[PDB]
Design an enzyme around this catalytic site. Sequence first.
Site, PDB file in Angstrom:
ATOM      1  N   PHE A   1       0.836  -1.195   0.000  1.00  0.00           N
ATOM      2  CA  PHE A   1       0.000   0.000   0.000  1.00  0.00           C
ATOM      3  C   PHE A   1       0.872   1.246   0.000  1.00  0.00           C
ATOM      4  CE2 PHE A   1      -4.048   2.066   0.524  1.00  0.00           C
ATOM      5  CZ  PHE A   1      -3.691   3.292   1.048  1.00  0.00           C
TER       6      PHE A   1
ATOM      7  N   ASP B   1       9.331   3.046   1.420  1.00  0.00           N
ATOM      8  CA  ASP B   1       8.153   3.769   1.907  1.00  0.00           C
ATOM      9  C   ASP B   1       8.038   3.597   3.417  1.00  0.00           C
ATOM     10  OD1 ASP B   1       5.575   4.610   2.666  1.00  0.00           O
ATOM     11  OD2 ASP B   1       4.634   3.868   0.837  1.00  0.00           O
TER      12      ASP B   1
ATOM     13  N   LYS C   1       2.419  10.745   8.055  1.00  0.00           N
ATOM     14  CA  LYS C   1       1.717  10.292   9.264  1.00  0.00           C
ATOM     15  C   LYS C   1       2.357  10.812  10.555  1.00  0.00           C
ATOM     16  CE  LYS C   1      -0.486   6.092   7.436  1.00  0.00           C
ATOM     17  NZ  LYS C   1      -1.917   6.401   7.689  1.00  0.00           N
TER      18      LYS C   1
ATOM     19  N   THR D   1       1.913  23.854  -4.918  1.00  0.00           N
ATOM     20  CA  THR D   1       1.643  25.127  -4.249  1.00  0.00           C
ATOM     21  C   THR D   1       2.270  25.247  -2.859  1.00  0.00           C
ATOM     22  OG1 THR D   1      -0.475  25.366  -5.423  1.00  0.00           O
ATOM     23  CG2 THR D   1      -0.141  26.720  -3.443  1.00  0.00           C
TER      24      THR D   1
END
Lengths: 460, 461
Positions: free
Chosen positions: A178, A287, A318, A342
């Site tokens: 994931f 990851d 997280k 941005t």
Amino acid sequence: DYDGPLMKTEVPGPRSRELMKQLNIIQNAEAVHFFCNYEESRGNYLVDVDGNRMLDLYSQISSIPIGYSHPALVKLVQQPQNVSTFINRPALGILPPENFVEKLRESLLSVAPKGMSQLITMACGSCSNENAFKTIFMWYRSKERGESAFSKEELETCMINQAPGCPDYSILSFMGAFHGRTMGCLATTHSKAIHKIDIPSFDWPIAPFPRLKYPLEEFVKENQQEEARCLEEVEDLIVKYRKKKKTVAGIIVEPIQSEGGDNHASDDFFRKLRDISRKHGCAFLVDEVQTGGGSTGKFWAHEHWGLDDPADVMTFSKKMMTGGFFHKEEFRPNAPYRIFNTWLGDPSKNLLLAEVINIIKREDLLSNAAHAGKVLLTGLLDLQARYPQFISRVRGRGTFCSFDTPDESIRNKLISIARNKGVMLGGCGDKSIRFRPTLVFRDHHAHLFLNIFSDILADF
Amino acid sequence: FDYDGPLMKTEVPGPRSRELMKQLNIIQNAEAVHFFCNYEESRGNYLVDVDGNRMLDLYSQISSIPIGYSHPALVKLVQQPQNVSTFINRPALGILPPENFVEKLRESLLSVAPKGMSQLITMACGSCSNENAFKTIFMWYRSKERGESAFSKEELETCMINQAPGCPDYSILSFMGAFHGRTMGCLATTHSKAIHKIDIPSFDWPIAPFPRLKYPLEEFVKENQQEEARCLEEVEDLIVKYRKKKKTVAGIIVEPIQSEGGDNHASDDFFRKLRDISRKHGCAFLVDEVQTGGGSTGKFWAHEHWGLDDPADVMTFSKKMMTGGFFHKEEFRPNAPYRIFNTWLGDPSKNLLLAEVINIIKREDLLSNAAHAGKVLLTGLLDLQARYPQFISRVRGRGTFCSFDTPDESIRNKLISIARNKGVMLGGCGDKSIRFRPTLVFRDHHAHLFLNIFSDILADF
Ligand code: FES
């Protein structure tokens, strides 16, 4: 913090159910499990709108680093000089605040992984991984074209989504992975069908992730063979996709697969995978969005591998409050405005993170995770011995623990029962129960859970 | 709320900025950095840098600061003890929302919902807003095709390994010049500059021409009508073409005004007809208001100018709105949970701020102010255009959303650099355009401060 949980109603209670009804008018609210009183929440304890106080071992999908309403963070918001940071959000890529670099030194740079001198910030795990992909694609094209300018053909075709401007390169990922749900991430995600179905994807290679057999000391040979088989298939895939003119520019993997069902592999497997990546000129992308932040007992989980060169790129989010990725100097983009958006994170999150990292260091919370996690895992192994008809494949590292139930209904029933008894647990995979305690989860919290859950099993 | 006007001490970037830029360049490519800022001393329309320069900011952090810097109403919010938790306890909003979640939405986003869109999902930025809008549209289109049938066994199997039929080969139609974000889904619909796109894998999705209007508008009425008609035809042809390619167009995405591509406008009529084309071919019509949204065109959402009761199927937002997300019609509501999802789904602290922003916008009549201040700005630009045709052309705008072209990128960049040193921060877009994105507390007198500064610049250029 609080002494223990305190329950008043079933969960969700009447007030949560009323709010859930209201929310379901404007959006699908089926996923909501209850509504929360965060003002009254403290440390490891989450308070809901019906006044229930539960021991939270899920921590907002492993994103709350040092508990609810931490006094050190309260003090930060109370300081008059910090007001501007909360109400003046900069376009960080072009107009950073005066203290941007120094706050990065106080926070993220102070925990940089080995070999990675570069850092870019992002607002979440998904744009962290998306931009890590892009950084890798750019780096790979740079290798191929060398110190040459973009060709006219490349500059013209990229504007209309065509090769050679838009190469057909791929990222290799693992079954059970994931990595996020934006369309780039989602292509490397292989957790549950409901995450993936009806969404267009990329023909990128998908390798098997090792499925270890438990208990570990009874299946040493079988597990090494399983890991060896998977490593071979990774290498075969890399060769196969180069032949398909879909060159694997990078490999992404979690140190522990979370949403896929807390799938572990040996440190040896990851060291060998790292080597395979280097051998084929693939960027190795780790990851640590969920494993990062110290719950495994080290700040980054890959630190357990003991490598001076663990990876080329590493993403996070997280627990780190902000997202972003560290990377090797050679992966630095060659021109501005290629890796950009941005906001590129939020200085207010960096403000909080700096204090979080200070607390983790001052209070030795990495060691505490190792210690409290061992108490938890030892207890889980005991309940596994005592209740083999309910508990199996008990596994973990630090507080990052999990176990399997015989099926999905039992898994859901146990979670439901535990919640009403004052303990919030998370599920992963079909029938696994997982633990993601915050970093102020201590020995006695582990003992509290174990004793509550023991009574649950006896009555089950 | 206030400063008198700009006040310059040094060139920009000044020595303290250059030192900080040197430090930052060690850890990342910092070539995009303009200068370093002192936000604590910034107020209203004025950005103060680390060298003590005070500039009139007509770029507003890439059009994302809604009511100026250090607004006293927002200061007050952070000062309230009851709001501390909202800033330090960030929830997984999809599963564990705060007690006040719905009410704060009623105070903010829901109070400005577009016509015909009863649904709302929040996101943390413009890119994940558009990405999840795409996914919502794909699921909706598939739902249309399978009717009441459940997920087939083959679909459930193939989708896990990135294959059809589980992963359909459907497309989103986008326009040349568009900008919709830079995550890999968004990026496929983005067609702004090469440097944004080059070396990144993409999708074979249809790309339509966006009308290029000719100026002055009143001297090209027939030509502009024909240009828009041409583009509409090519849109329809592409949908048909891609249906035959078995790459069915599930949705069309468009900006009401193209921003990064070079402030490209089109008639309200064009968008109404485009909407009709979308519906006709069963494509979802997705309007990206990430940059046009929040009031600078004189209406809260730029699409409101079109005057439709049914303006779109989905509409995304971010920037000025502090949070991202998308409104959508009821029929686009996801059938099951965990299909549109992520860890945070925005941030309640941004919702807290946005409720007060929207309160200020309404109480201070800032929509109408933007229309007025914008008319004054545009009138001044048209004057400078008449006086300096060697440097200024194609002056255009709606509200304060204004722009003009320069002869080349070199001159564009020089003018921006000179203006900044003279106390005004301007933005660029496209090859050679200069654009204006003032915050909503930009007034007619700020327009004149700029116009007088730029007039002197042009006289000496
Ligand atoms: S994609 Fe990360 S915040 Fe939107």
